[PDB]
Structure 1
């Protein structure tokens, strides 16, 4: 599923993402936009370390989910990576929450640092009613 902007903003809000661990909804929207263009089916194989990034937040299989094919990987969200490819983003959100509970917080995603950190992200939630 490819979400439309405000649809996703409200979906994330209903799931408890607004201000989760101090992260605003606009920050989450900026992350999803640059990671997958709001596409729950997005996937990216990293030939270098044999890991794969899954879903709307492009969560990596080396540390966060299990796909059974990443060498020496762990599964911190304790989810099959398949759960990160569903149209319903509840599981993906639970995992994204797990990621940010760690030291780096939202900075875990290099994309957020590259295109969301110290940026004006107002536009992501404007007019969405969140």
Structure 2
């Protein structure tokens, strides 16, 4: 499923993401936008370390979900990586919340640092009623 902007903003808000561990909804939107273009089916294989990034937040298999094919990987969200490819993003949101509970917070995603940190992200939620 490829979400429309405001559709996603409200979906995320209903899932309790607004202000989760101090992270505004606009930050999550900017993250999903740059990670997957709001596409829940987005996938990226990393030939370098044999891991894959899954879903709307491009959550990596080396640490967060299990796909059975990533060497010496962890599964901190305790989810099959397939759960991160559903149209329903509840499990992906649960996992993204897990990711940010760690030291780096939202900084865990390099894309956020590159495209969202110290940027004007207001435009991501304007007009969405959130």
Q: TM-score, normalised by structure 2?
A: 1.00
The gaps in structure 2 that reach 5 residues or longer are none
Please give the per-residue CA displacement for 1:19-59, whole angstroms capped at 9, x wherever unaligned: 00000000000000000000000000000000000000000
Q: Matches of 1:82 and 1:28 in 2, distance apart?
A: 21
Q: Matches of 2:47 and 2:122 in 1, distance apart?
A: 35
* CA RMSD between the two structures: 0.1
Q: Matches of 2:88 and 2:12 in 1, distance apart?
A: 11
Q: How many residues align?
A: 130
Please give the per-residue CA displacement for 1:98-129, whole angstroms capped at 9, x wherever unaligned: 00000000000000000000000000000000
Deviation at 1:84, TM superposition (A): 0.0
The gaps in structure 1 that reach 5 residues or longer are none
Q: SS in structure 1 opposite 2:53?
A: strand
Q: TM-score, normalised by structure 1?
A: 1.00
Runs of 4+ in structure 1 off by over 3 angstroms are: none
